[PDB]
Design a protein around this ligand. Structure first.
Ligand SMILES: O=C(O)C1=C[C@@H](OP(=O)(O)O)[C@@H](O)[C@H](O)C1
Ligand SMILES: O=C(O)C[NH2+]CP(=O)(O)O
Ligand SMILES: [Cl-]
Ligand SMILES: [Cl-]
Ligand SMILES: [Cl-]
Ligand SMILES: [Cl-]
Ligand SMILES: [Mg+2]
Ligand SMILES: [Mg+2]
Ligand SMILES: [Mg+2]
Length: 426
């Protein structure tokens, strides 16, 4: 076990050039592999989740070149589904954006695969996706527990026709099926049976699919039609947006202890839903300036809010620790799927927030946070969850230190987090 103790930080100010978006990166890499032509990606994220995708693509026979700095990557598209001739084991860490999309895509071609990862990934649901894939003819075996990885998949092709996807636990099941659908044997219709959470991530998927030359008919997020005969064609150059979830910590830091912070790589017209974290901060009293390729947060005040955060579940965690600095009791609602992510985040957040002095109601799908007058120095457990480390770093914006256990867990999406935070810490 390792730990990092951050002494109290008296002022936050500066600028951060954001790491690339994890969500965008993994979608673009998979579509680049399937597409015709070479995709020239820039601002790609270097993090564990991307590394696992890259490693899978290597095993799957994709030729690519990654720059020394790991942000520039040229991917030679296969122009078809994967075709492999020896059984492969794909270790996918705890990367949902690799596991879910690859579970679908590997059904399209020819080969034999075991999709696995870290212990926690074996405890994250995938049954809703498998059920839909099987409707379209897939051959998928649960190797351990029913409805969970690890999976054994044999390539079969996916049939034309109508399938049903439950959207209530993860949007990633729909994302995964959408991405594979153009390579099915004909027109695909996806009917949603179990209302959709994390809706903005579907918007990301559709947007990037269009960049790669594929049209999808979205009938009010309840039915999606993917017309027949389409193929992915590389857009050529592809710029990955900066990560809006990663930005949340620095915008919040300014809201708490600024000063002002400018983050670059996201702006008013970015596709990522998590830019909407800035709208929530603004409701708390931060001053927000929107640019085209930047967002600025400036200290104003911090008042508690009571909002539905289903649209921004990842950045919503940042509100939980920001709430420690707000006037009044904050409620973060409609975030059930916190429970099925890197850890059970509702349980973890409740435990750790109480350790720094907050009083907390942990609801089934919500959390209510009453800040302490005086923050307590605690050794925060991070649960193999990058965001627990990043959210709790903000505690040091008080007059009190915070100790972060296993600080390297930030590597899932943001290996250089602490250095960027330090840059701002005056
Ligand atoms: O599709 C995506 O890129 C993501 C979807 C979200 O998952 P859910 O749809 O399960 O909320 C989010 O938590 C994850 O970090 C990224
Ligand atoms: O990044 C996050 O906060 C949640 N990730 C879930 P995954 O991307 O592993 O499905
Ligand atoms: Cl920087
Ligand atoms: Cl309590
Ligand atoms: Cl409780
Ligand atoms: Cl402690
Ligand atoms: Mg289990
Ligand atoms: Mg109809
Ligand atoms: Mg205990």
């Amino acid at each position: 076990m390792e730990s990092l103790t951050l002494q109290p930080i008296e002022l936050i100010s500066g600028e951060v050039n954001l790491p690339g978006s994890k969500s965008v990166s993994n979608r673009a890499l998979l579509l680049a592999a399937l597409a015709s032509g070479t995709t020239r990606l820039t601002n790609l994220l270097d993090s564990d989740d991307i590394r696992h995708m890259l490693n899978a693509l290597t095993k799957l026979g994709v030729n690519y070149r990654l720059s020394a700095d790991k942000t520039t990557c040229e991917v030679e598209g296969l122009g078809q589904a994967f075709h492999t001739t020896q059984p492969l084991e794909l270790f996918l860490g705890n990367a949902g954006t690799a596991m879910r999309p690859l579970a679908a895509a590997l059904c399209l071609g020819q080969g034999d695969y075991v999709l696995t990862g870290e212990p926690r990934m074996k405890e994250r649901p995938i049954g809703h996706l498998v059920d839909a894939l099987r409707q379209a003819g897939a051959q998928i075996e649960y190797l351990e527990q029913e409805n969970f990885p690890p999976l054994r998949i044999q390539g079969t092709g996916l049939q034309a026709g109508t399938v049903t996807i439950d959207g209530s636990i993860s949007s990633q099941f729909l994302t995964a099926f959408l991405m594979s659908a153009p390579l099915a044997q004909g027109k695909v219709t996806i009917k949603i049976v179990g209302e959709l959470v994390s809706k903005p991530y579907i918007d990301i998927t559709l947007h990037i699919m269009e960049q790669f030359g594929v049209q999808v008919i979205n009938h009010d997020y309840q039915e999606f039609v993917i017309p027949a005969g389409q193929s992915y064609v590389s857009p050529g150059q592809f710029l990955v947006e900066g990560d809006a979830s990663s930005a949340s910590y620095f915008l919040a830091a300014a809201a708490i202890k600024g000063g002002e912070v400018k983050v670059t790589g996201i702006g008013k017209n970015s596709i990522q839903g998590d830019i909407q974290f800035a709208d929530a901060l603004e409701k708390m009293g931060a001053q927000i300036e929107w640019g085209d390729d930047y967002v600025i947060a400036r200290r104003g005040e911090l008042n508690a809010v009571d909002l539905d955060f289903n649209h921004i579940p990842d950045a919503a965690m940042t509100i939980a620790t920001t709430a420690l600095f707000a006037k009044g009791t904050t409620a973060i609602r409609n975030v059930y799927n916190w429970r099925v992510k890197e850890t059970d985040r509702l349980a973890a957040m409740a435990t750790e927030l109480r350790k720094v002095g907050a009083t907390v109601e942990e609801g089934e799908d919500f959390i209510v946070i009453t800040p302490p007058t005086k923050l307590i120095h605690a050794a925060i457990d991070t649960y193999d969850d990058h965001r627990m480390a990043m959210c709790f770093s903000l505690v040091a914006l008080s007059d009190t230190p915070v100790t972060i256990n296993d600080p390297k867990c930030t590597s899932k999406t943001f290996p250089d987090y602490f250095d960027k935070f330090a840059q701002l810490s005056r």
